[PDB]
Amino acid sequence: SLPSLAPDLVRDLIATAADISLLVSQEGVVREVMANPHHPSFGQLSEWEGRPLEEVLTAESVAKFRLRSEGLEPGRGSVAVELNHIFPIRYILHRLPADRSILMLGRDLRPIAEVQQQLVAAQLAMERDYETQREMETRYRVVLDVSRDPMVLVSMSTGRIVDLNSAAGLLLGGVRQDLLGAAIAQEFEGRRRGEFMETMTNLAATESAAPVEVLARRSQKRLLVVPRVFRAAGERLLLCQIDPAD
Amino acid sequence: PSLAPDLVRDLIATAADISLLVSQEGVVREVMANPHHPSFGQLSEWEGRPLEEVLTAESVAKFRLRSEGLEPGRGSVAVELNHIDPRSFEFPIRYILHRLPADRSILMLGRDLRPIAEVQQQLVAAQLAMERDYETQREMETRYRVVLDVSRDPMVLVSMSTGRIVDLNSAAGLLLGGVRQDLLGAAIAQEFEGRRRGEFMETMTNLAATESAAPVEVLARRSQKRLLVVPRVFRAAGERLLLCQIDPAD
């Protein structure tokens, strides 16, 4: 249990547990301000002393203080109320027995309000990144799908079709679901994964050289394939434009 | 103002969110709850047991360093500590330590850090979500840029909101008679003789909605070429994109 505590130490304990503490007379005048020597900001509230508590509360807080305080009788009890100064504060109120004065023990709510504000910013940032990602995905789909230039997108490591448009589908002789994930070499008669990917890669590396001549299995069309290599998110992709050769 | 010992305990228990009284030898002597502050659970079982039992390893060391030099009447020290509750869940408290003169016990006055840690955990989670969404945008943007630029189909992307060009490829640049640098940001309607933003954007939106093969015939100002424009409209993330497909008319 708590041993005996000198008045000076009791004042210091209270002042340090609370962020801001007020002694207020029965008349409603701020008799003493005790601010936490550890807690930031406060301490310029020297000026609050001698002045009406109502002078440092919003309209809404005054009425609220009045209501919750009128009932408060001096004894074993306390009551809690959130108030706003000219910043938000949780006060626990005690009425002292000798002169009906009110001791208000304040817990500063600015730190929690501050992190909430950050969370609000965080959440708006996520909305922005999500919308912008969807906007880019849509531009990508739109440009690729509407384009009359037959194009196929191929993964350099797997040799598989990762995307294409319907114009490529027509020239290749297949529908989207057949062609997505299909090994590109295997769509052309006589080609195999190894040598075909090496051909495209070498081709893509020189601007002056002709396209590759292939025969599409499904459509039985001779086609000219023109490959371009680029990096997307680290990964190497081949973008091939295809034309009828005959 | 002078105060009786019982009220003094009550003032101190209600000024802190939670407070502990620890003997000089390190045994928890009292856990004082603040009845107006949100519950920490039943922590009364801490009483009569060592403080070291209820702190993480790092906090034990930290409490040692902060408190050991602390003298009575010689001020107080702030320290943030991680507790481990009887159910093995951790919770953070910022304490102010005083050493009491009568017996050299330590009175620890706590501010609850749970709501701050909770929000901070949400902030870290949000960063992670943003990062994943950013990387995905880079992939899409890279693909979009290469596809648009490589495509021989002449295309101009127009903002529905402003009627200004937001992108195009060089096949479109050639037909319009301009370089990228001059066309980006430019009002699309003003590229074409006798056309105006309001009527032109309306015509494009209405035609797109009709799903028609009939183009708009226009005369490009810079190149003086007769062109055929087929619009399509796409909606993403609460705004619209007008895609103009362009062909020479002759």
Author numbering:
A (entry chain B): 6 to 91, 98 to 257
B (entry chain A): 8 to 257
The authors write:
The redox-responding transcription factor PpsR (photopigment suppression) from Rhodobacter sphaeroides is such a multi-PAS domain-containing protein. PpsR acts as a repressor of photosynthesis and tetrapyrrole-biosynthesis gene expression by binding to palindromic DNA sequences (TGTc-N10-gACA) present in the promoter region of PpsR-regulated genes. Additionally, the function of PpsR is regulated in a blue-light- and oxygen-dependent manner by the antirepressor AppA that, together with PpsR and its cognate DNA, is able to form a light-sensitive ternary AppA–PpsR2–DNA complex.
The functional relevance of the observed dimer architecture is supported by a large number of contacts, which lead to a total BSA of 6180 Å2. The PAS core is N-­terminally flanked by a helix (αN), which again corresponds to a classical PAS N-cap and constitutes a central part of the N-domain dimer interface, in analogy to the N-cap of PAS1.
